[PDB]
Amino acid sequence: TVFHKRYLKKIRDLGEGHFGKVSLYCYDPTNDGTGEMVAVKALKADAGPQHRSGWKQEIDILRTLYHEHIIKYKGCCEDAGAASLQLVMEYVPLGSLRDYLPRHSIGLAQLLLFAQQICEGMAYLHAQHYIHRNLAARNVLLDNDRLVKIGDFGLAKAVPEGHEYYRVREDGDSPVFWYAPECLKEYKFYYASDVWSFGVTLYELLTHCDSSQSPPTKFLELIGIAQGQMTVLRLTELLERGERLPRPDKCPAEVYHLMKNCWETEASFRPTFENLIPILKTVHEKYRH
Numbered sequence: 558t559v560f561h562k563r564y565l566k567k568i569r570d571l572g573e574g575h576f577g578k579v580s581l582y583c584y585d586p587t588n589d590g591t592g593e594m595v596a597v598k599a600l601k602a603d604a605g606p607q608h609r610s611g612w613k614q615e616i617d618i619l620r621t622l623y624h625e626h627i628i629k630y631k632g633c634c635e636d637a638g639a640a641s642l643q644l645v646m647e648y649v650p651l652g653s654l655r656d657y658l659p660r661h662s663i664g665l666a667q668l669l670l671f672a673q674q675i676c677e678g679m680a681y682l683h684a685q686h687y688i689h690r691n692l693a694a695r696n697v698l699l700d701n702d703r704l705v706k707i708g709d710f711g712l713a714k715a716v717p718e719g720h721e722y723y724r725v726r727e728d729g730d731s732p733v734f735w736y737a738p739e740c741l742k743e744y745k746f747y748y749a750s751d752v753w754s755f756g757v758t759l760y761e762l763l764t765h766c767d768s769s770q771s772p773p774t775k776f777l778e779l780i781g782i783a784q785g786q787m788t789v790l791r792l793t794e795l796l797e798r799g800e801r802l803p804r805p806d807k808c809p810a811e812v813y814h815l816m817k818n819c820w821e822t823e824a825s826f827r828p829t830f831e832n833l834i835p836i837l838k839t840v841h842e843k844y845r846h
C-alpha cells in the first residue's frame with residue numbers, strides 16, 4: 558500500500574513515540590474533506606544511522622503483524638523532506654489509556670476486559686516470535702469502550718527461533734520502571750519479560766493511569782532522587798528483596814495476586830500470555846453484570 562504526501566492534511570500532533578512524532582492527518586484526494594483520518598508516525602530528519610535502521614525495523618514488524626488487538630498498518634508514504642518512510646497507521650479514536658483513564662471513570666470489569674485483550678494481542682505477537690520491549694498503558698490505544706489495541710513497536714524485536722531471549726544494551730530511553738530484573742541486570746529480554754511489563758500495565762489501568770500512583774513515581778519514592786548513576790541498581794535491589802508496586806484502591810485481592818504472579822523474580826514462574834487469556838476471561842466474567 559502507498560500514500561501520497563499531496564493528499565495528506567495535518568489536523569494536530571498526537572504525541573511522541575520511540576523513533577519520532579505521531580500526527581493526525583486527513584487523507585483526502587477528492588479535496589472535499591470526506592477522506593479517512595490516519596495516524597502518521599515520522600522519523601526525525603536529524604537522526605543518525607543508529608535510529609534509521611531501527612525505524613525500518615519498526616515498519617517491517619508492523620507490516621507483518623495482523624491482529625484485532627494490534628494497531629493496523631495502513632501503508633507507507635514517501636517523505637521527500639526526511640528521505641525516509643512515513644508510517645501510516647489507523648487512527649484509534651479514543652487514544653492511549655494513559656490519556657483516557659484519568660478523565661474517564663471506567664468500570665473494573667471493563668479494565669479487566671482491556672487486560673484480557675492486551676494478553677490476546679501479546680500472545681499472537683509471541684507466536685510470531687516477537688517481543689514488544691515497551692508494554693505500558695501509554696502504548697495501549699482505545700478504539701471504543703469495549704476494544705483495545707497495542708500501539709508502538711519502536712522497541713519491538715524478532716527473537717530468533719533457536720534462542721528464548723534477545724540481548725539488549727545500555728540506553729537512557731529504556732522503560733526501566735516497566736522492566737523485569739533480568740533485563741536490568743543480565744541485559745536479556747525473554748518472552749516472560751513482556752509478562753512482567755503486562756503486570757505493570759495492569760497496575761496502571763487499576764490506578765486509572767493516575768500520575769501520582771504511576772510506576773516511575775512509586776519506585777522513585779522508594780529509591781530516592783539523589784542516587785547518582787545508581788537509580789537502576791537500587792531498582793534491581795528492591796525488586797530482588799521482593800518489593801513491588803502497592804495494591805491500587807478498590808483493586809480485588811485475587812487480581813493483585815495475579816499481578817504479583819506476573820512480577821515473579823524467576824522468569825519461569827511467570828505465566829505466559831496464553832495462560833493469562835482463560836484466566837482473565839473468567840475474572841472479567843466474575844466482575845461483569
Ligand SMILES: N#Cc1cc(Cl)c(C(=O)Nc2ccnc(NC(=O)C3CC3)c2)c(Cl)c1
Nearest residue numbers: 571572573579596648649650651652708709
Ligand atoms: N509514548 C508514547 C506514544 C505511544 C503511542 Cl502508541 C502513540 C500513538 O501512536 N498514538 C495514537 C495512534 C493512533 N491514534 C491515536 N488517537 C488519538 O490520539 C486520539 C485522541 C485523539 C493515538 C503516541 Cl502519539 C505516543
